[PDB]
Design a protein around this nucleic acid. Structure first.
Lengths: 257, 146, 171
RNA sequence: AAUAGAUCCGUAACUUCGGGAAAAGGAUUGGCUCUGAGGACAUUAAUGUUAACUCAGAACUGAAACGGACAAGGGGA
RNA sequence: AAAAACCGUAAAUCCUAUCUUUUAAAGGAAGGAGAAGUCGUAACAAGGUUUCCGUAGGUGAACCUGCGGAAGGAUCAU
RNA sequence: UUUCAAAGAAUCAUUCUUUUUAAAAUCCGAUUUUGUUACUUUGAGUAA
RNA sequence: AACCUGGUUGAUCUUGCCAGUAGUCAUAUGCUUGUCUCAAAGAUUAAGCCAUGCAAGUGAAAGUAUAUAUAUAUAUAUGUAGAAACUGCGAACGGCUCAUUAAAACAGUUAUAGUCUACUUGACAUUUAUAAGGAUAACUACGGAAAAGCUGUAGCUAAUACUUGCAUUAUCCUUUUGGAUAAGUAUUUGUUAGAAGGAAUUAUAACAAAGAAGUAACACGUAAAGUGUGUAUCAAUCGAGUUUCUGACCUAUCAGCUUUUGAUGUUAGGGUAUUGGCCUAACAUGGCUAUGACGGGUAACGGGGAAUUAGAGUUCGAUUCCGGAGAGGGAGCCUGAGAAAUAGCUACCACAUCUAAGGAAGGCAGCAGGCGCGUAAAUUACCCAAUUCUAAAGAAGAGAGGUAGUGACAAGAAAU
């Protein structure tokens, strides 16, 4: 037959997974989740090759059996949960919160997060639809549908959704003074203010982003993430702080130890 | 005067009785001709009157044979490069494109065409803009930069 | 059954491989006629059941002039732009012409406006005389072999002029 | 003795390129009930008056048979 | 439900013609190689009739003649 | 064959950067747009 | 590492080829083999035939339990468990091979404003109830044939299998609140208006109609109210199907092809999940072509790749992976979301097995091995310990796969 495929070869493991060539034959194909397979990783990989909590897949299963891992302040049990672009994952046995961030080098990395700021996740809505009786709903990259949004919120804005009540708090728009992340660009991991946009008739629209070192780059409109306005990046960025570090002077920094 | 087939062209969705013809702004940067907006033709597969909606890509070409009814043939001259000898070389492919009666087509004229949903066995395109280009010799032979 | 096994654009013939995959399908034809109401259900692709009507008697029908609909039953089939066999065999298709009763519509008119929303539309004498006869024309619009039921809109104006002129410089 | 009528499909070696050739070799063929096309004539684009049998298609039906007798090439190397 | 028809999908067998690939075949007619065989002087010199070409005819064979050419000739030249 | 050129700082004697010089819409003497394409520079989409 | 030498001759200079030379992740083969690491391995021809053994099932809070056993206070209530069984779900993944395939596939690059979409996740619904009806397995009892994934009557009983079926929400006037009012989700048809996209016959609202499938009659236990199973829609997800554009081996001793049997298009319809000559009827006479079509060959699966490089290039690409096709070779078909599936079925031929002769069942181009072919290719080993899959998802399977075995295919380190 020609049904939906159910395996991924180890060589065909996605780019940012960073899995060894000889360590077996197959990598897990994430079950249908809230985020795309090409841009999210399973919790098994996340806690194995980064957290290093266990040494075998079955040990990871035994960990997952206890209702200790939590996503968006609620319980999850299936070993194939892609964490997604932005979220919060909580572990109560150690009372530690992790939040998924990127690197200027193009990967996924967990970031230690305190309890107060661990209750806030930022979601970029992807679609705006109208339902029966004039109620407007927003569909997010998070695979989450938020009904009854403000008339203020537009398509590309980002929304301060609370984890527990499942309700909006505030909106953040996309002026030339709004901090935006790049999701899957070849220059992924750069934090900038965006100098301006460039809308093209019936095609992709290219937006220019400016950095803290006056570097200017361009990116497709599809894969941007409103993270905060000119005041500050609202959430805690990783150690690299989202500024991309040039190769030669990066080698200089590495050499100078 | 407008229907002569063994049927009637309905002009779907145009309404007849309540209100206060139908035409669409198509978008893309092209304009609806006054001829199309004040004509009397009725069609189902017309880009500016029918249920189609232009999406996909945009091509440009020459007219070759307008003898059919409501269908014309478009060839796409261009240049193809060869990596071995490092010299460009000519290569072409034609493509059957539908035409709306609002546009007068003549052999050799430059026509712009847009992609539309499969409309016939191998006709998947609809003409949008036509400019008068005279010809000398044979339309088949004649080649242009477009 | 859909997409192979025929000549090409240029005029040649393509060699055949790729043994017929099921999703091409091409279900056998269904022919719906006039009689007692009886329908079947077909296991369409994706478990989407499809209603195949084999014998239809009644359904919905609409005045476009007043924008209304009333249930009734068809009487006879008299014309279709398609092949003459489908009208000589008393079957139903998407864009056929058939004959309907007038009594339900006349009763609605009497109960609403009197005399034998946006009222006061002045109607038309040509349809008035046909109503007086009591059996009228109507064009089906839905696909009976797809929806399992019939629906059409009564014909008015120059459309009926063209239909009737082809019907009956006339045989 | 074998068909042989008519329509349709297809038709080789050779050749003086004109033919061979109806090559060879096949398919259809009744009855009843219908559909379409093929003209002339007169009124201020439209409505009327009126005539052949000729083809193409369709269902239905019969003990699967229908150039039902009469009439009529056996082909090939 | 067996059973039956219908348009339809169409397996499989045979006939007919064509195409593609190997192979038989009495004899005929070529080429090559072989070995000191047989017949001649054809060609390389003015090769003992300058050579060669195109074409028609003839001879045992190399060849010859007729017609129109070329010098790659045996002449760069009263 | 259809816009040429001129002018100024910074290494060593040179190179290099920068300003304007027609007409037509845009702004109350200044604020600024004036073919297509091949081509070429850049970018983004770029599976492992 | 941007390389030349012997050979025409009495000797010489040339054009020119033969030969020398080195590589192959390119095979076979001859000799020889003191170590270790690492590991290609019945593609070449026979997608030829196969003995045999296996290769896909599924139960730890949670459908169903007098097959069945135990343990607690005293036949009372609970439990702990449970083969056989009905049902759910997968079995349509994987693995293997390359015969067909020459604008078909494949790759890059779109569109789907022309569709569908299992599991999961997130929002969330419309026209007897102190708990409703039968219909049956395992089993018990009589059998039968040689035999197999064989089966009759009798009795039964269940379930989250099958099937009937138990409020109420929203809106307007005086204006917290009194009154009045409306009651269909998809899907289909007819008539109007009309947050986004670039453009809607978009979202949606109103009216006239039809009308599915439901909204819990199902089981367990967490905060010092929860979960499981299952149900309507929307969206995403894991995808698939059509589809635009650009791109290829040799050959003209293949120059005109296609069009009664759809060729090209228009109109209308059937059909499909959507669109379309996909198909039907009518009408039109059209479409491709020395920029090499139609044809023929390919000891031709396509691609990123491999061999060689001064740089250009030429040659191999079955082969770790992506995509395509296939399971003897055509044809057909049920179930199922998803198969035209082959360790699912049906029919033909060619094979071939068992046969009490009446009749049954078959596909190793899956992991091993046999025959045949050829120069040519490894054990009928161990285990799911690593990866990852399936399900009622910790405790069970997994010839996917890892290890072991044979191994001078190649590669690297280094004694005598």
């Amino acid at each position: 037959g020609k049904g939906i495929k159910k395996h991924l070869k180890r060589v065909n493991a996605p780019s940012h997974w960073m899995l060894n060539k000889m360590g077996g034959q197959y990598a897990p194909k994430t079950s249908s989740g809230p985020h795309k397979l090409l841009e999210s990783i399973p919790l098994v990989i996340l806690l194995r090759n980064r957290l290093k909590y266990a040494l075998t897949f079955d040990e990871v299963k035994m960990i997952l059996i206890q209702k200790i891992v939590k996503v968006d302040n609620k319980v999850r049990t299936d070993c194939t949960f892609p964490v997604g672009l932005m979220d919060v994952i909580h572990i109560t046995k150690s009372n530690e919160y992790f939040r998924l961030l990127y690197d200027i080098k193009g990967r996924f990395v967990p970031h230690r997060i305190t309890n107060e700021e661990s209750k806030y996740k930022l979601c970029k809505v992807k679609k705006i639809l109208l339902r029966k009786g004039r109620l407007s709903i927003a569909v997010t990259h998070d695979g989450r549908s938020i009904p009854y949004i403000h008339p203020d919120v537009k398509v590309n804005d980002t929304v301060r959704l609370d984890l527990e009540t499942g309700k909006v708090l505030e909106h953040l728009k996309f002026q030339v003074g709004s901090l935006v992340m790049v999701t899957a660009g070849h220059s992924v991991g750069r934090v900038g203010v965006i100098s301006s946009i460039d809308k093209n008739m019936g095609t992709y629209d290219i937006i220019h982003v400016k950095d803290s070192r006056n570097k200017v780059f361009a990116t497709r409109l599809s894969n941007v993430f409103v993270i905060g306005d000119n005041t500050k990046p609202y959430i805690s960025l990783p150690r690299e702080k989202g500024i991309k570090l040039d190769i030669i002077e990066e080698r200089r920094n590495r050499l100078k130890a | 005067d407008v229907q002569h087939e063994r049927a009637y062209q309905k002009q779907e969705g145009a309404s007849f009785f309540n209100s206060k013809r139908y035409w669409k702004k198509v978008g893309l940067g092209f304009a609806t001709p006054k001829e199309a907006k004040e004509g009397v033709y009725v069609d189902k597969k017309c880009p500016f009157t029918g249920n189609v909606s232009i999406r996909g890509r945009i091509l440009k070409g020459m007219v070759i044979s307008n003898k059919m009814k409501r269908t014309i043939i478009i060839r796409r001259n261009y240049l193809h490069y060869v990596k071995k000898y490092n010299r460009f070389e000519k290569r072409h492919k034609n493509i059957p494109c539908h035409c709306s009666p609002c546009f007068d087509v003549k052999e050799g004229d430059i026509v712009t065409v847009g992609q539309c949903r499969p409309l016939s066995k191998t006709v998947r395109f609809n003409v949008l803009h036509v400019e008068k280009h005279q010809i000398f010799g044979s339309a088949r032979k004649q080649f242009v930069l477009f | 059954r859909d997409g192979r096994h025929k000549l090409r654009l240029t005029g040649g013939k393509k060699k055949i491989h790729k043994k017929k995959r099921k999703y091409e399908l091409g279900r056998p034809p269904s022919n719906t006629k006039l009689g007692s109401r009886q329908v079947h259900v077909v296991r369409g692709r994706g478990r989407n059941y499809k209603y195949r009507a084999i014998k239809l008697d009644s359904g919905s029908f609409s005045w476009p002039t007043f924008g209304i609909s009333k249930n009734t039953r068809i009487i006879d089939v008299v014309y279709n732009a398609s092949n003459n066999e489908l009208v000589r065999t008393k079957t139903l298709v998407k864009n056929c012409i058939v004959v309907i009763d007038s009594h339900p519509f006349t009763t609605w008119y009497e109960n609403t406006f009197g005399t034998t929303i946006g009222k006061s539309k002045n109607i038309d004498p040509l349809l008035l005389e046909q109503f007086k006869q009591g059996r009228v024309l109507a064009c089906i619009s839905s696909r009976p072999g797809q929806c399992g039921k019939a629906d059409g809109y009564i014909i008015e104006g120059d459309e009926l002029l063209f239909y009737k002129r082809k019907m009956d410089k006339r045989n």
